[PDB]
From Swiss-Prot:
InterPro entries: Actin, Actin/actin-like_CS, Actin_CS, ATPase_NBD. CDD domains: ASKHA_NBD_actin. One of its GO terms (cellular component) is striated muscle thin filament. In vertebrates 3 main groups of actin isoforms, alpha, beta and gamma have been identified. The alpha actins are found in muscle tissues and are a major constituent of the contractile apparatus. The beta and gamma actins coexist in most cell types as components of the cytoskeleton and as mediators of internal cell motility. The modification N6-malonyllysine is found at residue 43. The modification ADP-ribosylarginine is found at residue 155. This is Actin, alpha skeletal muscle. It is found in: Cytoplasm, Cytoskeleton. It comes from Oryctolagus cuniculus. Belongs to the actin family. Residues 88-101, 336-348 are annotated as: Interaction with alpha-actinin. The modification Tele-methylhistidine is found at residue 51.
């Protein structure tokens, strides 16, 4: 079976039963008659997925064909294919993915799983609450015995690309100039290399104000060496206080809490003890300790709280897919070509 995890920024693709994706490449299509993903990267670019939701279907077909043919070297008509989706995904989109897989790619079998749920599986759990934060969107997804609890899911627009754009803004306020699309990629690299989550925002602002102890240098492609100081932790602080970029949302600690509070009292303790971090935007050093501190301050004083931050969490959605698609007991769960022929795209609602 194939496993394809389509993100707003990065596609992760490979074979069920493997420990890691074979291909990780940008979720882009480029035109000057069109180039896809890593081919487009080597050369106007469009992202077919926005905030985790597929919005350009023709370009999404290009991404999928590139995945099957170029990245995995397979004919999709010969492999059951597991795909992933956002924890909240419009009904019409679920049908269109299904329609395309059966009618365009002629897959023999298909299934679509919620991204955050797969990450939980990759951590060795069937119960817990996942914070999955990527390039385009963030969700909190409470999960009991393998199944997301849809009424308790929380969503934030805020994710990694917004964090990059904010780092550009505050570095520009410092006296640099980061405004172009190329500069966006440079600042993404700065973010990934040098940013971290402060345990206490104010305390670290004070250290940065009165000393150079938190400063790091970065050699730009153009040869200027810049210095990054409080920007290192101000950038990801936005996750905890979205008002830094004018967003009204609760921060990720409060959305975690709010999600747990919408669940049955009998499972809340299990959720609090199994907070699993997923996605590239959870990679900041310090994030687990900060989450622990913030959730402790919101939760009952008696509550046992644990934040799990798997080292492999850039790829845990994919790994979870690999685990699920290669389970013997999953064999009966696939949507078959016959089922699709009889029920149409609407089959996805009954089976996934
Ligand atoms: C099995 C299967 C389905 O459950 C599902 O196909 C679900 C069921 C449908 O839910 C639905 O028709 C409903 C959405 C669904 C059904 C049951 C309960 C519920 C789930 C969560 C909750 O109410 C409510 O939206 C919350 C409290 C969560 C939240 O963060 C805020 O409101 C805010 C903030 C914000 C920043 C502003 C608004 C949003 O919520 O974002 C979310 C909520 C919806 C959306 C507009 C984003 C998109 C593009 C998704 C839509 C329209 C999804 C529709 C459906 O997805 O953004 O909504 O998803 C994938 C898997
Ligand atoms: N070490 C790091 N520190 C901070 N951010 C990082 C790090 N590594 C990757 N990221 C960010 O993670 C994001 C990519 O993560 P991921 O692959 O989980 O997202 P996606 O699946 O493409 O998007 P989404 O899930 O939002 O649709 C990018 O914004 C990237 O800059
Ligand atoms: C190395 C890498 C990282 C990434 O996450 O890439 C995804 C994919 C990408 C598409 C445009 C880019 C020119 C191509 C490849 C870069 C891929 O845009 C992102 O970099 C966007 C733009 S800045 C940011 O933080 N996210 C994230
Ligand atoms: Ca993702
Ligand atoms: Ca706020």
């Amino acid at each position: 079976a194939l496993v394809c995890d389509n993100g707003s920024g990065l596609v992760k693709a490979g074979f069920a039963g493997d420990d890691a994706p074979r291909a990780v490449f940008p979720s882009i299509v480029g035109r000057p008659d069109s180039y896809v993903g890593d081919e487009a990267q080597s050369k106007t670019l469009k992202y077919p997925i926005e905030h985790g939701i597929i919005t350009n279907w023709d370009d999404m077909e290009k991404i999928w064909h590139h995945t099957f043919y170029n990245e995995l070297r397979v004919a999709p008509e010969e492999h059951p294919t597991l795909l992933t989706e956002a924890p909240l995904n419009p009904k019409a989109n679920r049908e269109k993915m299904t329609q395309i897989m059966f009618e365009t790619f002629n897959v023999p079998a298909m299934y679509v799983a919620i991204q955050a749920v797969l990450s939980l599986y990759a951590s060795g759990r069937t119960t817990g609450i996942v914070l999955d934060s990527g390039d385009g969107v963030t969700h909190n997804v409470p999960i009991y015995e393998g199944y997301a609890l849809p009424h308790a899911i929380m969503r934030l627009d805020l994710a990694g690309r917004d964090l990059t754009d904010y780092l550009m803004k505050i570095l520009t306020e410092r006296g640099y100039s980061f405004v172009t699309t190329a500069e966006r990629e440079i600042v993404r690299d700065i973010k990934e290399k040098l940013c971290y989550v402060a345990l206490d925002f104010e305390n670290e602002m004070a250290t940065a104000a009165s000393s150079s102890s938190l400063e790091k240098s970065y050699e730009l492609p153009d040869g200027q060496v810049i210095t990054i100081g409080n920007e290192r932790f101000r950038c990801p602080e936005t996750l905890f206080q979205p008002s830094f970029i004018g967003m009204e949302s609760a921060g990720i600690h409060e959305t975690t809490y709010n999600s747990i509070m919408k669940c049955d009292i009998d499972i809340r303790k299990d959720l609090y003890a199994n907070n699993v971090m997923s996605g590239g935007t959870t990679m900041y050093p310090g994030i687990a300790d900060r989450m622990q501190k913030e959730i402790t301050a919101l939760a009952p004083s008696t509550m046992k709280i644990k934040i799990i931050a798997p080292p492999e969490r850039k790829y845990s959605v994919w790994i979870g897919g690999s685990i699920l698609a290669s389970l013997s007991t999953f064999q009966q769960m696939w949507i078959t070509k016959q089922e699709y022929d009889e029920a149409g795209p609407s089959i996805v609602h009954r089976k996934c």
